[PDB]
Copies of this chain bind each other. A is one copy, B any other.
């Protein structure tokens, strides 16, 4: 009887799909989380120089978005005065071509009606600004902090589902591996960049962005012991760089050390969805099923 067949197909639709498969009896809720990150590693740059956590992590106190320096270019002992600007901003020969005002595309200062020597043969437009000017860009290759590949990331996380009042936490040697140590919160940087689909050598010489996700997909009808985190690594490359300066005083004069920092930016996002049996969606689904069953 075709009526019996259509009744059966509608019935199997509701029970087999809405409830068994899509869990129509459940209601989704969000979570609130806190993430803490600790960096373990040392680097040597060549006199010889050593970089500690207080030096290669931005910001110091930590944040969901933080940068780990992998390479840099330093312009030291930079004061404020009159100096020749970069020749890429324009090579001049006579004072007629030096119009006072503002530069563009890399403006290092305010120009002036004067031409001064740059490298004993070319004459560039004189500027007022932070002098001496930032040296022509020559990114070190290989990167200066190439040892960053072996630093470690200890990630602490504590979530809470406000709707169901459920809290969980993600916690003498261990390193994370996808199918060997799946529940080790300590990650090596080279592993994360490889898992994001990125070459750490290139991502160290220019910089890059690596996203980190902690998926707390939990079925609360089960135990809380089975509500575990799942880590996934995302490649969000054109590079990542920023400029920061260390200001100091010598002989009463204020100087600065300009750094152009190439580093890997890590973004940690915690998103999860939990469900629990409710009576409203069950009745809603069965009523819709009865309606379609009849029609």
- Interface contact B61-A58, CB-CB below 8 Å: yes
Q: Quick one: CB contact mask for A259-295 with B, threshold 8 Å, 1 for yes?
A: 0010001010101000000011001111111111011
Residues on B with beta carbons closer than 8 Å to the beta carbon of A242 = 60-62
Please report which residues of chain A, range 25-80, place their CB below 8 angstroms from some CB of chain B when the two chains form the complex.
Answer: 30, 32, 34, 36, 42, 44, 47-50, 52-55, 58-67, 80
Interface flag for A234 (CB, 8 Å): yes
Residues on B with beta carbons closer than 8 Å to the beta carbon of A14 = 283
- Interface contact A128-B50, CB-CB below 8 Å: yes
Interface flag for A248 (CB, 8 Å): yes
Given A248-B249, A288-B286, do A102 and B42 touch, yes or no (CB 8 Å)? yes
Interface flag for A110 (CB, 8 Å): yes
Given A242-B62, A247-B248, do A287 and B283 touch, yes or no (CB 8 Å)? no
Which residue, A14, A54, A243, A258, has most C-beta atoms of chain B within 10 A? Answer: A54
Given A32-B269, A291-B291, do A280 and B18 touch, yes or no (CB 8 Å)? yes
Interface flag for A136 (CB, 8 Å): no
